[PDB]
Amino acid sequence: GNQQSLAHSRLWDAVVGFLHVFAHMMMKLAQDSSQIELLKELLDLQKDMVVMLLSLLEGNVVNGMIARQMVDMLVESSSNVEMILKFFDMFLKLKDIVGSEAFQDYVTDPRGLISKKDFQKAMDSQKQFTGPEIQFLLSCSEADENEMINFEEFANRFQEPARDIGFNVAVLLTNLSEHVPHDPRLRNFLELA
């Protein structure tokens, strides 16, 4: 009774609005280092939101009505979901590139500080991020002085707070894929994630 009532309720609209606000707020708070606590609290709220969805999708048969409703909601809120997935994968690839050897020979600094220009050249050599992504990563990077960036801290800044929300999103996507097969629209989200 309660699950069907929520399914027919206006909850979805609220979900779409929260997705929009989350997607823009995480991107804005990432740039400034003084709002890390606010970013973590936002991530926790998003985690609780994904938990509620997961709970709304309890005990559904293959091709369930609630499942198709949530797929329709996702395709309605495609842009924000793509932004959030891009936010996760950019930092994942940033961690991998920081660990990679090419950046190690690019930095050329015993102090462990990478210049903005050299960082841009190293990313353009790795050829994994688009130009706007390079600019956004540079903006999020914190240069103490003379454009010297602490790449290790920059990479590890957003790792721990974003672990739970990423796992919840992955679990939700896996459940939706395994319970709603042969859906062309969901495959886009699956391949973006």
């Binding site: 050897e101 090419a102 050599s125 050829k127």
Partner: protein, 48 residues
């Protein structure tokens, strides 16, 4: 450990249909490991 010798030898792909492997590995792992590092490991010349 013994197979490490023919990595740089020019005649590495002998007795095997694909003689363009070295190029394929260069194009596959050039971005991550480094194009110059791959060239040194495989004994190839980029300009050539």
């Amino acid at each position: 450990q013994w197979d490490r010798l023919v990595l740089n030898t020019p005649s590495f792909p002998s007795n095997y249909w694909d003689k363009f492997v070295k190029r394929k590995v260069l194009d596959k792992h050039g971005d991550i490991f480094g194009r110059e590092r791959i060239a040194e490991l495989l004994g190839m010349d980029l300009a050539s």
